[PDB]
A = this chain, B = another copy of it.
Amino acid sequence: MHADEVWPGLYLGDQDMANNRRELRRLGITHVLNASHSRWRGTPEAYEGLGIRYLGVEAHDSPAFDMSIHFQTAADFIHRALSQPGGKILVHSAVGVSRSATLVLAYLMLYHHLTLVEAIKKVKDHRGIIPNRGFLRQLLALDRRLRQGL
């Protein structure tokens, strides 16, 4: 789709999710952290109407880009979002999971006393690989058969 709840109230999602009003409202998203904001496209206009608080971080998914200057600010924003009653935040990038996941991991290390190894394990454990519930049902049926001896 996609978005994964990698920490309570904390959704790691993709650009399409960030652009999708039905889903944003359905999830009850109150904050959006765009880890690939383009100074040349501004804040998404749907967001004020949705009552969504926005933080855009201008970041390129390049190994020479310094994301670290945004670690604390982004973590603070995530903390604000999750600290609000009913607060739920979507963290996403335009493409690739590196930019958004990096800010989530920094948040977990700074606000939830996890080591990087522990934070990585936490996020990976909650990243789904079969969002398609039909396919999951199909795999479960296969599982039952193979367990039964096939």
CB distance from A36 to the nearest CB of B (A): 12
Q: Is A125 an interface residue (CB 8 A)?
A: yes
Residues of A92-150 whose CB lies within 8 A of B: 96-99, 101-102, 105-106, 109-110, 113, 115-117, 120, 123-125, 127-143, 146-147
What class of interface size applies to chain A in its complex with B? 35 or more
CA–CA, A46 and B80, complex, Å: 40
Q: B137 touching A51 by the CB < 8 A rule? A: yes
Majority SS of interface residues in chain A? helix
Residues of A50-64 whose CB lies within 8 A of B: 51, 61-64
For A28, give the chain B residue with the smallest CB separation. Answer: B133
Q: Is A71 an interface residue (CB 8 A)?
A: yes
Which residues on A are within 8 Å of B, measured CB to CB?
A: 1-2, 8, 26, 28, 51, 61-68, 71, 83-86, 96-99, 101-102, 105-106, 109-110, 113, 115-117, 120, 123-125, 127-143, 146-147
CA–CA, A115 and B110, complex, Å: 25
Query: Given A102-B139, A109-B146, A115-B147, A85 and B130 touching (CB < 8 A)?
Result: yes
